Amino acid sequence: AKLVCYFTNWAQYRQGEARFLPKDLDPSLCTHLIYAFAGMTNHQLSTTEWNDETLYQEFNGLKKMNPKLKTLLAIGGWNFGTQKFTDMVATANNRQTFVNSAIRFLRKYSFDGLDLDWEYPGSQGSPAVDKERFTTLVQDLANAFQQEAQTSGKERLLLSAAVPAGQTYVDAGYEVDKIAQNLDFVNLMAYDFHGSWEKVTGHNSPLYKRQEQSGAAASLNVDAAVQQWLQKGTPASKLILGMPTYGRSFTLASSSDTRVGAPATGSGTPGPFTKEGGMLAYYEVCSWKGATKQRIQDQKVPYIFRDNQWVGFDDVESFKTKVSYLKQKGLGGAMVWALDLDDFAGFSCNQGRYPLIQTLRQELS
Numbered sequence: 065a066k067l068v069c070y071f072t073n074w075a076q077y078r079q080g081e082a083r084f085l086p087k088d089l090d091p092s093l094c095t096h097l098i099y100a101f102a103g104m105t106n107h108q109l110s111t112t113e114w115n116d117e118t119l120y121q122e123f124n125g126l127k128k129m130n131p132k133l134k135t136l137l138a139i140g141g142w143n144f145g146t147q148k149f150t151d152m153v154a155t156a157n158n159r160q161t162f163v164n165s166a167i168r169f170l171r172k173y174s175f176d177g178l179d180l181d182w183e184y185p186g187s188q189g190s191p192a193v194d195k196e197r198f199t200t201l202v203q204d205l206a207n208a209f210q211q212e213a214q215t216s217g218k219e220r221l222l223l224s225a226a227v228p229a230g231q232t233y234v235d236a237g238y239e240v241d242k243i244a245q246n247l248d249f250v251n252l253m254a255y256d257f258h259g260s261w262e263k264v265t266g267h268n269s270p271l272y273k274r275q276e277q278s279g280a281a282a283s284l285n286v287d288a289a290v291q292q293w294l295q296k297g298t299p300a301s302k303l304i305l306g307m308p309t310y311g312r313s314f315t316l317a318s319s320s321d322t323r324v325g326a327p328a329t330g331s332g333t334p335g336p337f338t339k340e341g342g343m344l345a346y347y348e349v350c351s352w353k354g355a356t357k358q359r360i361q362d363q364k365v366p367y368i369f370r371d372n373q374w375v376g377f378d379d380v381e382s383f384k385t386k387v388s389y390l391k392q393k394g395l396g397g398a399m400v401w402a403l404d405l406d407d408f409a410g411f412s413c414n415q416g417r418y419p420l421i422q423t424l425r426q427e428l429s
């Protein structure tokens with residue numbers, strides 16, 4: 065099975081033991097390492113950090129120590145926008161120009177492929193006309209890839225994509241049965257089902273729902289997201305169960321109603337290293353002295369709380385449960401966001417290096 069792990073190029077700016085650079089990577093940990101993120105510049109693939117090209121060399125240089133390892137560069141992401149995408153796929157010229165830069169770009173820096181992270185077409189200002197143009201973009205990348213394979217004599221560039229769980233988002237711009245045919249694998253983002261953008265606590269990545277849920281709220285969980293991807297045409301071997309090494313935090317209106325569904329007055333206190341309210345890396349959760357951990361029996365994931373802080377996260381156990389579930393489901397593997405959010409250096413949790421992802425490697429392999 066596949067263990068797809070994402071590296072982020074902003075984790076390098078974190079202070080202390082949280083600073084993450086390629087050297088922090090374990091070559092044998094995952095089967096596929098994805099580099100987030102690359103941007104666009106005049107309909108072309110481009111770097112986002114003063115040192116992406118140096119980082120690229122260390123990233124891809126890991127394949128010497130592990131020749132079976134596969135690397136991809138992802139373009140886009142949540143904070144990328146849609147303009148540049150909607151625009152690049154508008155004319156054959158731009159598509160044809162993007163594609164050619166993609167191939168020259170990946171090869172130049174030794175990437176084995178490209179992971180598309182257009183969040184998302186047919187939404188966030190994307191005319192539902194982009195839904196179908198996306199499909200086209202896919203084939204274009206696929207075709208050029210299959211062709212360049214022949215001419216260059218090297219292995220065919222891989223093509224993946226980070227995809228949303230939401231029925232709404234899926235219908236907005238994803239021709240599933242079609243695009244699944246051209247993607248080598250699909251990175252299902254089964255998280256962010258809940259977060260501080262809501263006025264009641266809920267889990268970031270629940271496997272199942274709680275009895276108390278039905279209707280739309282019923283989909284807000286992994287299994288829901290998974291059936292929703294299979295049913296539409298995705299072959300189980302190409303669907304990859306994405307998992308979070310981060311949880312989402314809320315601030316409780318009252319430190320007395322600390323249950324899943326309680327009143328939250330907003331985001332959870334920013335974490336010391338991640339410094340952004342409503343989210344926390346697992347290593348920020350780990351430590352928590354004099355705190356109370358619970359388990360949502362229905363959704364098989366935990367949560368913790370101390371005073372007015374409430375955070376729904378993923379642990380070693382819930383990860384075992386999820387790999388267990390994807391296995392019964394016959395999914396091609398697990399995807400994880402992100403390497404730098406796990407206690408990658410055994411510096412906080414006392415469970416060694418990469419407690420969660422090491423868990424994944426073990427259960428999966």
Ligand SMILES: C=NC1=N[C@@H]2[C@@H](O)[C@H](O[C@@H]3O[C@H](CO)[C@@H](O[C@@H]4O[C@H](COC)[C@@H](O)[C@@H](O)[C@H]4NC(C)=O)[C@H](O)[C@H]3NC(C)=O)[C@@H](CO)[C@@H]2O1
Pocket residue numbers: 070074140141142143144181226251253255256306310338340343399401402
């Ligand atoms: C499996 N693919 C996948 N893609 C989605 C990712 O976009 C998303 O992670 C989020 O990506 C944002 C960038 O697109 C991150 O924004 C950065 O946030 C940090 C602070 O928090 C760490 C800022 O300092 C900036 O670096 C900011 N960058 C930009 C360009 O705005 C965001 O942090 C990150 N969120 C998390 C929890 O990691 C994942 C997960 O939802 C999806 O998975």
